[PDB]
Structures are given as structure tokens and as C-alpha cells.
Amino acid sequence: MTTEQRRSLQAFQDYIRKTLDPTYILSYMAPWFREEEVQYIQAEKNNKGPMEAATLFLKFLLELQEEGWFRGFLDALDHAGYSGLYEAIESWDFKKIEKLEEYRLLLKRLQPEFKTRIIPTDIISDLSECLINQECEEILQICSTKGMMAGAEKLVECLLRSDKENWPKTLKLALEKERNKFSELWIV
């Protein structure tokens, strides 16, 4: 049985990895994993990166034997703030996140001007709903300890990963108030 929904996961992966960082839902997931190997995933985060860490989290997830673990995954996403994935996996329908792929690749090709133009601090408060908490609390720590560009850069990185339905819109809302710049460059 379980194989059916895991298989639904297995075919339907790759949106997950490019949308997900396991560490947060790791904080949530402790009992379903051996206390060990959670660190494998984390060490993979700081070694290879969050995405590769995610695909490893998938490798470990899919092998999961015991019981009830699926709604564990779902609840983990939900309670950590990854919404559109909880939503999308409960309904198995991702169209939203794909229209996101549109705005995502747009940003990726537009990244440098984002870097120079933007001050990651003023706008973060506003589009914070669109981000994870650990996420939000970084950036500021980054541009606090490194610089406005580095911060912004990581901001983009976190944005490309976000599963939130409207985030390009709320972003546009956040700059269309604060000064302007990308208000003329970023459009919907």
C-alpha cells in the first residue's frame, strides 16, 4: 500500500528539491528518522548545499518503513511554514509552483541587478510571510555580517526556493512602496 503514495512522491519529486530545504522540517522530523543520518542530511547541507541535501532527504524519506510517516511529512511541511508543498502534496497538484518556475527563472536570469539595487533589510519585514523563519533570521545576519549585496543574493536564493503562491506579487508590492527600482524592472 504505502508504496502507492511514496510512488506518487517518487514520480512527482524534483519540484520538491528545488522548492525545499530539509533542515527546518528536520527540526520537526526527528522521531521518524534514526537520530543518526539526520546529521548526514545536515552535513550535506553545509557540504554540497541545501538542494543536494534535499534530494538526500528524499533518498532517506522514500526508504521509510514504519507507520503514519506520510502525514508526518505533510504535518512537518505545514507546521514549518512550507505551505504550497503541504497543500500541493495533499492535493498532488503543483500548477502554482510551476507558474512560479516562470517567475523563478525570470529572477535567476535577472539576479545581478537585484544584488546591486536592493537593500535586504527594509523589504524583508514586508515579504517575510513569503519566507521561512530560519530563513528570515538569516539574511539580516548575513548582510549584518557580510553586506547588502551578499544578503540580497541569499535573499534571491531563498526566494527561488519558496513555494508561496503569490510571492512575486507580494515582492512587487514590497518594492512598489520602498523607493522604486525593480518596480519598473520586475513585472507581472
Binding site: 502507492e4 503514495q5 506518487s8 514520480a11 512527482f12 498532488w92 510551476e98
Partner: protein, 75 residues
């Protein structure tokens, strides 16, 4: 033209289509063949959710390509 569709069970279905068809049309044919309603149907190609409105030509589906079918689970 001919294409492949892969259910979660692993079995593969072979369908005759054209570039002009819209994913909704294909969904209508898959409903017509195996009985799964179009609403509940979700097709994947090369790791992308396929949109009902667009066409196979837009996603660049040539002859003998493979879509994976997924279903809406469940109650």
C-alpha cells in the same frame, strides 16, 4: 504520432496524438481509455506538471515520448 503514458503501477499505455492537442484533450483520451476522470488526472513530462490549456508542441513532445500519470489520492 504516438506517445507513452506511465501510471504509478508501472504499466505503460501507448496513445496516438498530435502536436495540436491540448493537455486537456490528452486527459480526455486517457479518461476515455482507462476510466480515470480528467479532474483527478495529473500528467508529468521531464519533471514538469503539464498545463491543461497549452499544447504538446509547446512542451516539445515528439514521437514516442513518455508522460507519467499521477492520480489524486484519495479520501
Amino acid at each position: 504520432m504516438q506517445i507513452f503514458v506511465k501510471t504509478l503501477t508501472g504499466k505503460t499505455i501507448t496513445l496516438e496524438v498530435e502536436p495540436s492537442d491540448t493537455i486537456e484533450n490528452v486527459k480526455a483520451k486517457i479518461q476515455d481509455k482507462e476510466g480515470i476522470p480528467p479532474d483527478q488526472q495529473r500528467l508529468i513530462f521531464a519533471g514538469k506538471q503539464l498545463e491543461d490549456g497549452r499544447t504538446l508542441s509547446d512542451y516539445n513532445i515528439q514521437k514516442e515520448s513518455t508522460l507519467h500519470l499521477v492520480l489524486r489520492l484519495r479520501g
